[PDB]
A paper describes a structure:
Cystathionine beta-synthase (CBS) is an essential metabolic enzyme across all domains of life for the production of glutathione, cysteine, and hydrogen sulfide. The RD adopts the evolutionarily conserved Bateman module, consisting of two tandem CBS motifs (CBS-1 and CBS-2) and a surface-exposed loop (residues 516–525) extending from a CBS-2 motif. Here we show using cryo-electron microscopy that full-length human CBS in the basal and SAM-bound activated states polymerises as filaments mediated by a conserved regulatory domain loop.
We pursued the cryo-EM structure of full-length CBS initially using two constructs: one where an N-terminal His-tag was removed during purification (CBSFL) and one with a permanent C-terminal His-tag (CBSFL-CHis). Micrographs of full-length CBS from both constructs in vitreous ice clearly showed the presence of flexible filaments of varying lengths agreeing with 2D classes. Multiple maps were processed using both helical and single particle reconstruction to resolutions of between 3.9 and 3.0 Å. Both constructs resulted in maps with virtually identical conformations, and both were used for modelling. The CBS filament adopts a left-handed helical architecture with a twist of −108° and a rise of 51 Å. In the basal state, CBS regulatory domains sterically block the catalytic domain active site, resulting in a low-activity filament with three CBS dimers per turn. The domain-swapped dimer, previously observed in crystal structures, is the repeating unit, and helical formation is driven by inter-dimeric RD interactions, i.e., between the RDs of neighbouring subunits of the filament. Specifically, one RD each from two neighbouring CBS dimers interact in a butterfly-like dimeric arrangement, related by C2 symmetry, such that the loop 516–525 from an RD of one dimer forms a clasp around an RD of the neighbouring dimer. We also found that CBSFL-CHis is more thermostable than CBSFL by ~3 °C, possibly because it is forming longer oligomers and is less degraded than CBSFL. Though we do not know the exact reason for this phenomenon, this difference is likely due to the longer oligomers and stabilising effect of the C-terminal His-tag.
Numbering used by the authors:
A (entry chain C), B (entry chain D): 42 to 548
C (entry chain E): 421 to 548
Write the structure that this text describes.
């Protein structure tokens, strides 16, 4: 009854057999029209870009090319299989308009299927592990797909695994089908028909290697099968995060931790779709190097790719040392950075997970990074009320030779800060009159900072707020059971002042 | 000295003059190579997709086509002008490797220039208004660009406006240049050379209308100029958010509020680059309709576009009522949803801003949405300790006919929940032994929910956590100055149970 | 029933605490978890006014020390049949917790206090 994903493959493919015996319906890469009737046709024909800086940093000699699969409609390499699966199910007559699609997946296939359903009108229910980022959840919500989260540490064949939940949901919902990516032949077939043909046409046939991360296994299986059928000289390199058992031989998989922060790759079972026989070698990868390489890719090549691309490049820079000049290597970058915006892209999260250490972050910063804000020539001899009139503020600011002053009330509550030039511009434009209160022109937001903080902290703060107020806090008492507090401003600092101080110190 | 952005244009262009008299260096859309040497070449050749559902919902009769400019390298329509500006400055000899680029912009151009600098090695300093989302800030940080935020309510010519800060930074940093988008002729020229040619080639020349949002003005100015030089029959429709003064005639701009949540479009000044004479009509737009139309686009067409595209489509569905069958309309979608992930894409933020009302959210939900969780057949007659052994939990769970039970300690602290099937699978796989504690298999996360909450709240919760524990809280006292608290679990609910209840109620 | 009180607690303490949280009645339970009964604010006030008790006195003089233990699974018909004998019925649940699965432990965990008043109010609300 239950079609488990760990069953051995029933296929009989082997090298050299002509395509005419294939039981599957093969289609060549279609030529895109002048205008595509629907967004679903914007899948495929992705570019192959040359890597320039990451390779030389590690002494790589071969031409390293990256398959930017994050430019697809859904921003992932899992839009191909979604489209192919939907098309095959529709052509088989299994799926009709208004039917329900249940897919246990890691979100990328879920996003692709949600997009397909929104375009074509299906009820899409997505079952995914809990550890996936909330970005995918939000995008799915906007696409009108129903989400079901499942525990991360649940064994694949357990009752509450993502596949198990999806299967029992299919068992109980009427007119519901599962296009299971772990077992459907359409998954590897999509790559076999489009991804491999695209690669061979774009690279002019000649290449010596290919590196691809492994989830469901189609992304590597189809490409490897087509390449070995056409260009067997290519070495197929697989990747697998620590804690997963996809990589072989087995002793490579002996590790204590079963959970990893990297997403979209690695599983505790061997998929039925996967064909490990066409894999020339396997590598293990960890979160730290993967995210670091993803950040390096973003910062030095402009490829806005996710963690899996980082893992792929980290493994490639190791595996491809054997290659010499004139030989070509290819890497498959699954998805975009969009799915990981608050994840590894955030320095906060990296430091919280420990994947980045303060020494690694600070060793490359300028010489003024560790200096305190105390080193600045900050000052703020005066302040004004928020109810004060505009012309009054103008005249008083000129009375004492300042162009800006903090705004504070009688109770000591800081309201913001106002600048002379902005007030003058507002008066000239007629937006305010001298008798009007400064509330129309006041800058009512700022960041409260302390003298003890370094200039690096100030720089990190100024990326969010223009003005930072250097303040101190004193607490005064009447019997030591009767407390009172107040804060007591010093000067107004901006990136302008910081850079002026840096320039003055340099000269 | 200071080149203000509000100065009138010095150009002398007028209809019908041949290109040979142009002082500018024009280049036709280049043919992409088989493999692009660097990612910067992945700008242009974007697809034009047909809109199908948004048009008919409002009775639109014309063929509505959207220019998906969010597929560019930087995911925005502001990668074109960045590339063109960099190329023109390099070809003019103004910019050398290692030079500093300062750009006051709304982030999209900043992101494009940061990508260009990362590829080519420039010091990129980005000055933007504060109201921009943190997504752009994070992406810029990953690209190695220095960010400076400026107040939103600062007048454009004020000392601390984004343009003013950028100009004075250029004034004080050595070897620093500004490629100002508000004044550089390259901005509109990029569209005039590529965007318009792409549109005319893709649509086979025939089209009757064009709708485009307006920021710097190039996105509309260049396309309109080329179209009127080649296909004058097209009606050029501009858009402008409330609070901005770009739209004409003036009385359209009379509104109380000067600040709007929409980003990337609308300014308090007329850019020097903008040519309003080639605009056939203008429209005003507001945040609510813009974000609603963006969400509708995402949910019904799969176009992962931002708020500006929503504004453009909202204005188009109004302006294009005059068109009849057989005529074609074009809309320019600036950027991707990536820049607005935690913004309007989030229902929380929409409700907080009031752009969505609870009645509008609830009127379309199922009939069971308002029912309390109290209507379920939930139960949890037993619980177990976390230190208990695996085999003990197995035997006891079978002793009483349950397959799952919450995990709680002596003190009353809830640790999680464990399922029989997962424990059996772990034992079979050898990951645990009967004597081992349940800590290796326990699901140590969940969401605490109350009986009073509706099933809609439970559904929203289950999109994040698989298991939700229905608990109650009682507080007990010894003298009414001596308090004590405890919580007291009821049953374990999942989307499985919710959907089973829905099915049972339906039948 | 968000709160409960001890049986040894004083009368004035129960008065003040009941007003502290806007309830007029609360179940009475001890430290061991044994349910003793339930006490109402109005009856306590009447007893204080009549002089039968003082604020420092324990609630034992005014507590309603009898009730019927009922389960969520039971129908309103069963509740109506029960209320013909006892005024108050306590909706409780029972959970049993274990340390090695040979070491059992039990406890019950009250939900709310129901009477014919509440039943008829629910019926009226549903009818309208
Ligand atoms: C070229 C000649 C091929 C032959 C003779 C062949 C043979 C078969 C057959 C007979 C099945 C059906 C097994 C069943 O229903 O029990 C099957 C399924 C399948 N085929 Fe092929 N195949 C060919 C090509 C390919 C290619 C090119 C791919 C991928 C690149 C592929 C991937 C698969 C997969 C993943 C399945 C599903 C196996 C399962 O569900 O157990 N096949 N194959
Ligand atoms: C086709 C014949 C054209 C002529 C004779 C012409 C004329 C000129 C001249 C002489 C300037 C320099 C003004 C100065 O430096 O003071 C200029 C600048 C400029 N041109 Fe053109 N132009 C032509 C085409 C175009 C086109 C096709 C576009 C855009 C689609 C364009 C947009 C601009 C802009 C934005 C400026 C900057 C104006 C300023 O900075 O004040 N021009 N034009």
């Amino acid at each position: 009854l239950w079609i488990r994903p760990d069953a051995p493959s029933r296929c009989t493919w082997q090298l050299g057999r002509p395509a005419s015996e294939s039981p599957h319906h093969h289609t060549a890469p279609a030529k895109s029209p002048k205008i595509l009737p629907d967004i679903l046709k914007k899948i495929g024909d992705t570019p192959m870009v040359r890597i320039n800086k990451i390779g030389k940093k590690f002494g790589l000699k071969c031409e390293l090319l990256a398959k930017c699969e994050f430019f697809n409609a859904g921003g992932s390499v899992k839009d191909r299989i979604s489209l192919r699966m939907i098309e095959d199910a529709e052509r088989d007559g299994t799926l009709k308009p208004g039917d329900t699609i249940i897919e246990p997946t890691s979100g990328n296939t879920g996003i692709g299927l949600a997009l397909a359903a929104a375009v074509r009108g299906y009820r899409c229910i997505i079952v995914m592990p809990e550890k996936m980022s909330s970005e995918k959840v939000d995008v799915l919500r906007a696409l009108g797909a129903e989400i079901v989260r499942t525990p991360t540490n649940a064994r694949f064949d357990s009752p509450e695994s993502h596949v198990g939940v999806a299967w029992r949901l299919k068992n109980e919902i009427p007119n519901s089908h599962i296009l299971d990516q772990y077992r459907n032949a359409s998954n590897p077939l999509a790559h076999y028909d489009t991804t491999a043909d695209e690669i061979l046409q774009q690279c002019d046939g000649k290449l010596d290697m290919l590196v691809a991360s492994v989830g469901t296994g189609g992304t590597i299986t189809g490409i490897a099968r087509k390449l070995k059928e056409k260009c067997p000289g290519c070495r197929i390199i697989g990747v697998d995060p620590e804690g997963s058992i996809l990589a072989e031989p087995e002793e490579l998989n002996q590790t204590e931790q079963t959970t990893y922060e990297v997403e979209g790759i690695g599983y505790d079972f061997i998929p039925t779709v996967l064909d490990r026989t066409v894999v020339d070698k396997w590598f293990k990868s960890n979160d730290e190097e993967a995210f670091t390489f993803a950040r390096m890719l973003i910062a030095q090549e402009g490829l806005l790719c996710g963690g899996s691309a980082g893992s792929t490049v980290a493994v490639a820079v190791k595996a491809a040392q054997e290659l010499q000049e004139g030989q070509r290597c290819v890497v498959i970058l699954p998805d975009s950075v969009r799915n990981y915006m608050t994840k590894f892209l955030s320095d906060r999260w990296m430091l919280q997970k420990g994947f980045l250490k303060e020494e690694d972050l600070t060793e490359k910063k300028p010489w003024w990074w560790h200096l305190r804000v105390q080193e600045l020539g900050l000052s703020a001899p005066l302040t004004v009320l928020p109810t004060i009139t505009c012309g009054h503020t103008i005249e008083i600011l000129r009375e004492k030779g300042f162009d800006q002053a903090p705004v504070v009330d009688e109770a000591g509550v800081i309201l913001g800060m106002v600048t002379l030039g902005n007030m003058l511009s507002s008066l000239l434009a007629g937006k305010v009159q001298p008798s009007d209160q400064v509330g129309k022109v006041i800058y009512k937001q700022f960041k409260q900072i302390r003298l003890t903080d370094t200039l690096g902290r100030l720089s990190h703060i100024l990326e969010m707020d223009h003005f930072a107020l250097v303040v101190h806090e004193q607490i005064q008492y009447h019997s030591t059971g009767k407390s009172s507090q107040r804060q007591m401003v010093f000067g107004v600092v901006t990136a302008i002042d910081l850079l002026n101080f840096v320039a003055a110190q340099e000269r």
